[PDB]
Structure formats: C-alpha cells, structure tokens
C-alpha cells in the first residue's frame, strides 16, 4: 500500500556532492558581509545581536537521503493519492534510476534548496493537483521541483517549493537584479527580502531513484 510520499531519492555519491555544494554556497553568503548582513536582517531584523552560522541555522532538514518529492500520499489519506499511485508510469518507474538537473541554488530566511529542472519524461511523474496553483500561475508545469538542503528551525520543508516559486515569479517579472556578482559556479542574484539565487553556469546532474518513503 501507499507510502508517506513518492519522490526521487539521490544516490550516496550524488547526495553528498549536492550537500557539499549547498554548504559552500551558504559559506559564501556567510563569508562575505554584504551578503550575510542582508540575510541576517530579514531573518532576525532588530532582535538582540547574536552570532549566526548559516550552515547551523539551516541545520534542520527532512529525514532520509536527499530527495525531490513528487506526490505526498500520507499512506492513501491525502487527496489524489490513489490516482497518482495507480498510474502505469508510476508503477513502471518505481525502483528505476533517473538523472535530475540542478539549475540553481537558492536561499531565503526560511529555507535552502536546489531548483530541479525536470525532463519531459520526469514530468509524467509530476502530479497535477499540487497545492496553491496560483503560486505557479503562468509558469511551466514542474516549476517548484526542488531538493531541500536545509530550513530554519520552525519551517516545514514544504516551504522550500513555495520559496522557489516566489523567486521564479519575481524573475519572470524582471525584479531580479542584474547579478550582484559572480561566484565560482555562476552568477549570484539578490532578489530582495533575504532571497538569494545562484544560477549555475553548468547544471549539476545528480543520480536518483524514483521510489517511495515510509515514516
């Protein structure tokens, strides 16, 4: 019977490779004071001065090896769960390997992730009844696809996908900056309100298995 959720779980090698790249990006935001000051300000505003390690702040992360979620099923209880799981494409894809393209890394006051750009084949596994469709209104299907690398202590890692969409909505408008500058792996954008996106000069391909997770 049905899992807590379905998704693509990264292999040991790829999970550590993405983990490290996330870490380094947090350290770059934290090592340069233009960047840290602004993130620290939309995190804590005018709270008592306090030291902040971004890698520590984003220490919380959903259980299990790193993953890109498709459908939350809650063991059959969530809406659309049986209809998702009965699909031949899902049955067929279970236990099989995929490669996920990571196009960007992003951080907000609530979360740290990697944007996934799904192939057309992988989109056949993307559900069509996701919550808040207004949030991705006018964006291609599969826009919120992501791997959550960390989130702040009182944030549900589901927030990560909404944070990504919000960034993609702003960049569809053009309220993206010109890049604040270059980092080793690409152009860095300050979108405002403590939101940062690193657009990778070259996409990272990470290996993963499509399967189900139990709690």
Burial pattern 15-51, b for ≥16 Cβ within 10 A else e, equals bebbbebbbbbbebbbeeeebeebbbeebeeeeeeee
Are 148 and 111 in contact, with CB atoms under 8 Å apart?
Answer: yes
Distance of CA 26 to the CA centre of its chain: 14
Q: Which residue among the candidates 71, 110, 146, 185 is catalytic per the annotation?
A: 146
CA 189 to chain centre: 16
Resolution (A): 2.1
- Per 3-state DSSP, the chain is made up of helix, strand and coil in percentages (nearest 5) of 35, 30, 35
Does 69 carry a binding-site annotation?
yes
Topology adopted by domain 1-215: 2',3'-cyclic nucleotide 3'-phosphodiesterase fold (3.90.1740)
74: left (phi over 0), alpha (psi -120 to 50) or beta: left
Q: Is 148 annotated as a binding residue?
A: yes
Q: What separation in angstroms does the CA of 87 have from each of 31, 66, 82?
A: 47, 24, 9
Q: Verify whether residue 146 is a known catalytic residue.
A: yes
Domain map (residue ranges) of the chain: 1-215
């Amino acid at each position: 019977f049905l899992p807590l959720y379905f998704g693509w779980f990264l292999t040991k090698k790829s999970s550590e490779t993405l983990r490290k790249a996330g870490q380094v990006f947090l350290e770059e935001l934290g090592n340069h004071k233009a960047f840290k000051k602004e993130l620290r300000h939309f995190i804590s505003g005018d709270e008592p001065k306090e030291k902040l390690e971004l890698v520590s702040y984003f220490g919380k992360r959903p259980p299990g090896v790193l993953h890109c979620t498709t459908k939350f099923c809650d063991y059959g209880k969530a809406a659309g769960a049986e209809e998702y799981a009965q699909q031949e494409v899902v049955k067929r894809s279970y236990g099989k390997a995929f490669k996920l393209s990571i196009s960007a890394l992003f951080v907000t006051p609530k979360t740290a992730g990697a944007q996934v750009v799904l192939t057309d084949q992988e989109l056949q596994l993307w559900p069509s009844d996701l919550d808040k469709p207004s949030a991705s209104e006018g964006l291609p299907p599969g826009s919120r696809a992501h791997v959550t690398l960390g989130c702040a202590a009182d944030v549900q890692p589901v927030q990560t996908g909404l944070d990504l969409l919000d960034i993609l909505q702003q960049v569809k408008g053009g309220s993206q900056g010109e890049a604040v500058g270059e980092l080793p792996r690409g152009k860095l954008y300050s979108l405002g309100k403590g939101r940062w996106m690193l657009s990778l000069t070259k996409k990272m391909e990470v290996k993963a298995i499509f399967t189900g997770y139990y709690g």
